[PDB]
Design a binder for these strands. Sequence first.
DNA 1: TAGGGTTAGGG
Length: 183
Amino acid sequence: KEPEQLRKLFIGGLSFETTDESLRSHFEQWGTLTDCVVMRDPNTKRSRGFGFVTYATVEEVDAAMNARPHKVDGRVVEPKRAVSREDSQRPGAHLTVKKIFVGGIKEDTEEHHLRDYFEQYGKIEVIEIMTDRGSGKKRGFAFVTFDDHDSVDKIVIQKYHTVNGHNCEVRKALSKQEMASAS
DNA sequence: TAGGGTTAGGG
């Protein structure tokens, strides 16, 4: 059995009217639900506008994500891979982005090294292996842009990534200003 | 639109 964290989707933008039951009614169309909850304010019981659904397998999660866009109780909602409580504290953890930062890549890394690891996650649009503009020296990191934000979301929730023979660190790309704001 | 009484003892 796969870990609960990887079987779970965050569902944002729920209608006020959505309950555990109507959410379940919709998302069971793509597999067995082991968990399904709408988050509510404890005192007022009013919906917080989001919840979670958990499938019995990650394959069912993939099937649900392939069926976007999802309309639940008359509202288009925003399903996202569930980011752990720990990781949710990091700058940019919940951004909707198509680009990843790939850190700690060998100096002799070439585009094909990145394709041979990342193409299995989604359609690649742009690969940029970064060099210093003045010196031409390799800087040890790259950016990869995909055609679907879910490709990025599914990558960054995994721990290890092997490029050009060795582990690298993969994070959602923060803009120049976001990087400054995160410092 | 980021979590449900779900996060650092006591030796």
